[PDB]
């Protein structure tokens, strides 16, 4: 459903968002660097591991928008997978005797019948179909 270049960017974006969560909270008037990493993965993968949470108000608002980016990416995944299962249908078939490929035949298309039968008589008395 997702191109291989997009998946590597999602994984790389987890570390970049998580790395400055520790910086943002610590400098402003405490969560360890390793404790912040479990927070980002837990939100994206919906797992229930870890307990570290942001403390600073500025740190909250970043770890709060990230929880909206996690739902969109999952929701878009299941909507596209519903497009590789219902949209696999081409359309190319012969439609009756009025199909253009029969009125004006080409050398690449070959059609025939059984010699000395009723279909031969049908194709003789009609002068419009004198080309096939």
């Amino acid at each position: 459903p997702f191109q291989s270049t997009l998946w590597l960017l999602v994984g790389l974006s987890v570390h970049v968002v998580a790395v400055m969560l520790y910086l943002l909270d610590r400098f402003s008037p405490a969560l360890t660097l390793s404790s912040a990493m479990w927070f980002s993965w837990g939100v994206l993968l919906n797992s229930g591991i870890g307990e570290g949470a942001p403390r600073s108000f500025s740190a909250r608002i970043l770890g709060m928008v990230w929880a909206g980016f996690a739902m969109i990416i999952v929701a878009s995944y299941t909507a596209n997978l519903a497009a590789f299962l219902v949209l696999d249908r081409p359309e190319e078939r012969i439609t009756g005797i009025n199909d253009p490929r029969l009125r004006n035949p080409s050398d690449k298309f070959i059609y025939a019948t059984v010699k000395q039968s009723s279909v031969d008589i049908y194709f003789r008395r009609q002068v419009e179909l004198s080309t096939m």
Binding site: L85, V86, R89, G96, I97
Partner: protein, 89 residues
């Protein structure tokens, strides 16, 4: 779609004494269910289905990477154990 509709028929020579009773046995056989019974035994036994839209069910062969992912990670943590204890040692 059908573009020349003309049925079958038993062919007989002109001035044939049987030309009337042959054409009256066929009409009766239609209304007695006899010719809707020969169709059942000789022409209408289904053997292979058709394509009603595109219904797809998922089997094990369809899901290989998903199940091998967890099976491919159960051994990844074993190597992690031999280095996690190395931190204390």
């Amino acid at each position: 779609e059908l573009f020349f509709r003309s049925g079958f028929g038993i062919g007989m020579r002109k001035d044939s004494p049987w030309k009337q009773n042959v054409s009256l046995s066929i009409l009766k056989s239609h209304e007695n269910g006899f010719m809707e019974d020969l169709d059942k035994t000789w022409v209408r036994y289904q053997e292979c289905d058709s394509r009603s839209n595109a219904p797809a069910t998922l089997t094990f062969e369809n899901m290989a990477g998903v199940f091998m992912l967890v099976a491919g990670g159960i051994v990844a943590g074993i190597f992690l154990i031999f280095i996690e204890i190395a931190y204390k040692r």
